[PDB]
Design a protein around this ligand. Sequence first.
Ligand SMILES: *C(F)(F)C/N=C/c1c(COP(=O)(O)O)cnc(C)c1O
Ligand SMILES: *C(F)(F)C/N=C/c1c(COP(=O)(O)O)cnc(C)c1O
Lengths: 383, 383
Amino acid sequence: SWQEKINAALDARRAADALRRRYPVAQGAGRWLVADDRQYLNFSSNDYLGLSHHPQIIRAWQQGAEQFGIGSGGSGHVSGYSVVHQALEEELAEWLGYSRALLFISGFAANQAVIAAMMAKEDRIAADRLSHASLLEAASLSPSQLRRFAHNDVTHLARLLASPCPGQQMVVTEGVFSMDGDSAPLAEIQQVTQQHNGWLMVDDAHGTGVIGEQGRGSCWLQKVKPELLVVTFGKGFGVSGAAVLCSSTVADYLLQFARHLIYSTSMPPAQAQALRASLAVIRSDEGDARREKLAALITRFRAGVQDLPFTLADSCSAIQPLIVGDNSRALQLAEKLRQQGCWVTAIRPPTVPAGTARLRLTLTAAHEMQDIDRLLEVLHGNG
Amino acid sequence: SWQEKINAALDARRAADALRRRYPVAQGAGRWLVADDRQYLNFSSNDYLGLSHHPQIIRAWQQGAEQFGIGSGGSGHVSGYSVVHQALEEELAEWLGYSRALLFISGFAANQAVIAAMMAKEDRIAADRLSHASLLEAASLSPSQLRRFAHNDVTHLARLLASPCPGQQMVVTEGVFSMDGDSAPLAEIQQVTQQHNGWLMVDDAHGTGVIGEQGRGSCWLQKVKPELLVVTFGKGFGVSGAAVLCSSTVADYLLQFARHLIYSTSMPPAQAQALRASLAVIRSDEGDARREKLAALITRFRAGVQDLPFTLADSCSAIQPLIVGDNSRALQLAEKLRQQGCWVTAIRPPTVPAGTARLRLTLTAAHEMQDIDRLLEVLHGNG
Ligand SMILES: *C(F)(F)C/N=C/c1c(COP(=O)(O)O)cnc(C)c1O
Ligand SMILES: *C(F)(F)C/N=C/c1c(COP(=O)(O)O)cnc(C)c1O
């Protein structure tokens, strides 16, 4: 029966396997975390530039609501396409150097709409083995053929692409990777993809806003323009939502065929004003200050761990995995950090290679040097 | 090549076939529509209760931002599960009489996460031929078997279910249908689904908030509790987002397996406060007033069309399709309404049966009797 299927998918879970509970917080974004009325240094949010509490972004969200009300009313293809949506689209495209941008309610929605509209059964998707669940989930549902290349292995990607294919090949990878905060080799990737007449799709959720001149992100930093750029706004922009950046003809194609775009409610115009305000801060001198500060905090932390019995991943992004190895080790560590007021989150098997239990630490430009030193002090004292 | 595939999917579109452009508006939700600086009576938004501009909802969105900032910071399974998300979940579940509710960023996302997590290749989805693109799109991507039953045909549904199936059967339908605003026969549908040991999933996007005691929607009005209820908030709630309503064990199942829930950014807490404020208005005496007014406006309009050479669909929801038949007819009509300050949207083949060119009119409780009379006056004068 259905219940037997549900009770048994549940009942058959291992403990230190993959069971997951949600803890409610009063504040979850930026420097601090408030949980059951206790304040903690937050090293687990994705607010990399501390923009979630920026007063200009807050102000734009508030005044937007006064100007436009809240809900848009419907679809972009009906009466839900607001002048604010269109200004934001235009501002994104100009920023990142594309012809067009189309707004989406979330990155999952944007990654899904693209793949769904663009890939057919004859087609092939070549995706990095470590690509985000949203990319892979969609690629795996797609009727097209999914092939996963070894993380960042451009030789493998090359082989995958050179195999006879009855249609077209889309290559998918991330600008900054979710797990480890490492970058893809975009210049080389693009190079083999053009060699095989494929097109490239980059999800720069973790780089957007946070690196590059004016924060333009991984592609712009690396001098690569893929055919599809997906940026999402719930990380360094400090809000929520996403855009696909692309050419005139593909944006026209997506407007005709992308059902998720055709039939979904557009975002509240006030959310779109808050996104324009965030983009403005990101492109400004204040933008450069925040990115410089986050970089100095990363330097301070990486320097401080040299002395510690932990291993760091190859990241110079806000994402800093701290390899502990033994899961009882990690668990005990994480609970110790928490007891000392540093809120961190422990990642253990099966999520990652047995003996890779890591803390997935995040830093933001809202943090201060003395926070990093506290984290370091705490990592020293117990371990 | 890719470009040939894009240029040719485009180039090979028929005109009065399915080409679509987006018109930017200054205001798209509720009584009025502002476009290129002209005001129009808006008969094309999904703001059925006029709540998009309600001052208590606006106020909650604004003060939310002051209390919690904007972005949540990340996932519900990390530091993005706010006390406000949890109060909203609890308030929804209590309202609609379920054990649990899980929040989603949009209805598409919610319909996708459920189907994806719940349906396997052995399983079957039996969906109403007219189910919304989001339900069908997901059901069609699913590895499970999709079978479409004739609109509201419980005899056909019965046959579909009685066919040998190697797994489980999920029945999917809408509380109020998107296209025509008609209701499904939920009591009978549930009845055959239980007969065949299936479970039922209802998407009540178009009924939620707007009918039922305290606005509880189609299921509650019809005394049916399906196993999955999806409600979305961009229509009568006047905001954006969605929830799945379900049992303890299935919510636990969805928290473990629903990747779209596990790895997506949660909605801004301020958006969630605005949703709680909207639910409060909906459950209140003001709630009943708005629903009574929308009902009186529907009565006035349906009564006024009896005299006119158009045909109405079987709706007593805010959705009122006005059948015109001849597409040149519909087009000319719609452009005439617009020239007379009533913003309506014309739906023609191939979207609907040749000779079914209709205006898809919507009314809301923000409208007044004199708006309906203007629309009627305009429908009379030219036709
Ligand atoms: C973030 F880390 F909290 C969730 N990861 C989300 C993500 C997306 C999804 O977009 P969302 O807007 O959150 O629904 C797309 N790409 C990547 C790399 C990530 O991490
Ligand atoms: C509405 F009419 F503008 C769009 N129709 C959306 C819809 C959904 C999708 O949820 P969304 O929140 O807009 O992404 C799900 N079910 C139905 C019946 C409709 O109409």
